[PDB]
Design a protein around this ligand. Structure first.
Ligand code: 9SC
Ligand code: CLR
Ligand code: CLR
Ligand code: CLR
Ligand code: OLC
Ligand code: OLC
Ligand code: OLC
Ligand code: OLC
Ligand code: MG
Length: 356
């Protein structure tokens, strides 16, 4: 009741401060100058604004027993901001998972800021009926002196249009990305074993036919994995045509170092992408799980409208909205625990020390 807004002041400060640090890490540290971190910044701005504009007023309403204390046309604006920032979070998370998947089937700041503005303009688009209709008709934004989204059509259609189509895409594109990266690793182990098999074949060889056939199959396996090494095989395949067998065999042991080079490089690469898919999936998992109680309970407010205790349902909505607000505090901590780049960045900003 009266004591309950002491907890909420904590959740505001950790939100504001963590997300400021995320915006500072992406603005300053050059190891974060990529499209994914550009989305993560935009998300942190949404998280910061939710902490500044929405969350203190929600705390304020807890102090006035949910009876709305500000001007009456401020109610529909507060619900607009609340839905706007949460809608922008889900559409960001979806835009990350989609963009990161599309990139794995492919070979600029401007390209990222264009996508972000698209996410924000859709979020402003979908949230827009709330003040347009709500400022016109208080029956849509007030229930018994309390400022809450009252129109059940807005809750249902918004819950599915503005949160189930992005979630569907986010969950599908995440799972296909795991499978995409799993095939890439499978396909590189296969290319390692056939290169290594033909390395052992060239070294055992007695004649020009065995080397020429084995280097032809090394070049084929080279075309699958890729540039640099392919010509070096051709540098040795022309030796094997002339009959220069000892001469081709010594070139192939020189190919060995160039093969081991591209293997560890493409091998780190997929480990790092699967490290990153692991972090983003915790961000994704937490957003849904923490907002899941509020989402289900608010839809059940609408279904059993008369059948259920409106007072109990509403006393759970007021608890379950802070589990989702707490999700504004988590994304920064996730980055601290699972990225050296953010953890180092944050650790120096805490000592008021900004130069990379
Ligand atoms: O399972 C899933 C699927 C993925 C997903 C995405 C988003 C999500 O939640 C965001 C919805 C909150 C937006 N605001 C919250 C605050 N709310 C409000 C306004 C006035 C008074 C009061 Cl009391 C309240 Cl609560 C208005 C609407 C849940 C899920 N869950
Ligand atoms: C809902 C409305 C009224 C809230 C006001 C929006 C304000 C707080 C937002 C929207 C535009 C934002 C800025 C847009 C661009 C940049 C450049 C980037 O490199 C660092 C953050 C910074 C500087 C943002 C900080 C926060 C910001 C100023
Ligand atoms: C006391 C008399 C009038 C009957 C009232 C029944 C009410 C209190 C029941 C029926 C519907 C129930 C809700 C239905 C769905 C959910 C979502 C889930 O996360 C569990 C809690 C929650 C939010 C339930 C809490 C209890 C609930 C609100
Ligand atoms: C209050 C709530 C959170 C606070 C911020 C938390 C973190 C930082 C980063 C630090 O490097 C400079 C101060 C700065 C920007 C604080 C300024 C004051 C502040 C806005
Ligand atoms: C995890 C994050 C912690 C946040 C908790 C805030 C909870 C806010 C809920 C406060 C409920 C107060 C209440 O129900 O009001 C009393 C009155 O009897 C009925 O109007
Ligand atoms: C840096 C990336 C994005 C900055 C711009 C995006 C930040 C959010 C856009 C501004 C905003 O929130 O505008 C909503 C406004 O209330 C309309 O009525
Ligand atoms: C995005 C939509 C912009 C509308 C804002 C209305 C704000 C009204 C603020 C003053 C309210 C005075 C009152 O209720 O009287
Ligand atoms: C006479 C007045 C008629 C008024 C009725 C017709 C208005 C038509 C407009 C848009 C359809 C509904 C828009 C739904 C999207 C906005 C609401 C929203 O996004 O709510 C999500 C919320 O977070 C969930 O908890
Ligand atoms: Mg083999």
């Amino acid at each position: 009741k009266n004591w309950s807004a002491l907890l909420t002041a904590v959740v505001i400060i950790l939100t504001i401060a963590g997300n400021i640090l995320v915006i500072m890490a992406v603005s300053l540290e050059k190891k974060l100058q990529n499209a994914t971190n550009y989305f993560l910044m935009s998300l942190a701005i949404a998280d910061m604004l939710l902490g500044f504009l929405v969350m203190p007023v929600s705390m304020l309403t807890i102090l006035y027993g949910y009876r709305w204390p500000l001007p009456s046309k401020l109610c529909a604006v507060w619900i607009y901001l609340d839905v706007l920032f949460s809608t922008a979070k889900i559409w960001h998370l979806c835009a990350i998972s989609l963009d990161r998947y599309v990139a794995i089937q492919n070979p600029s700041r401007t390209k990222a800021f264009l996508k972000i503005i698209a996410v924000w303009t859709i979020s402003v688009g979908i949230s827009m009926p709330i003040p347009v209709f709500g400022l016109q008709d208080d029956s849509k934004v007030f229930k018994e002196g309390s400022c809450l989204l009252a129109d059940d059509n807005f809750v249902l259609i918004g819950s599915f249009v503005s949160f189930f189509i992005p979630l569907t895409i986010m969950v599908i594109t995440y799972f296909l990305t795991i499978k995409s990266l799993q095939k890439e690793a499978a396909d590189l182990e296969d290319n390692w074993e056939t290169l290594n098999d033909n390395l052992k074949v060239i070294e055992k060889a007695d004649n020009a036919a065995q080397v020429k056939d084995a280097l032809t199959k090394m070049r084929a396996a080279a075309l699958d994995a890729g540039d640099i090494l392919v010509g070096q095989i051709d540098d040795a395949l022309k030796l094997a045509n002339e009959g220069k067998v000892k001469e081709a065999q010594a070139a192939a042991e020189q190919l060995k170092t160039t093969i081991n080079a591209y293997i560890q490089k493409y091998g780190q690469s997929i480990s790092n992408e699967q490290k990153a898919c692991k972090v983003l999936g915790i961000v994704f998992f937490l957003f849904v799980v923490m907002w899941c109680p509020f989402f289900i309970t608010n839809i059940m407010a609408v279904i059993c409208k008369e059948s259920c205790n409106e007072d109990v349902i509403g006393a759970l909505l007021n608890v379950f909205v802070w589990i989702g607000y707490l999700n504004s505090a988590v994304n920064p901590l996730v980055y601290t625990l699972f990225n050296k780049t953010y953890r180092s960045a944050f650790s120096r900003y805490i000592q008021c020390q900004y130069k990379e």
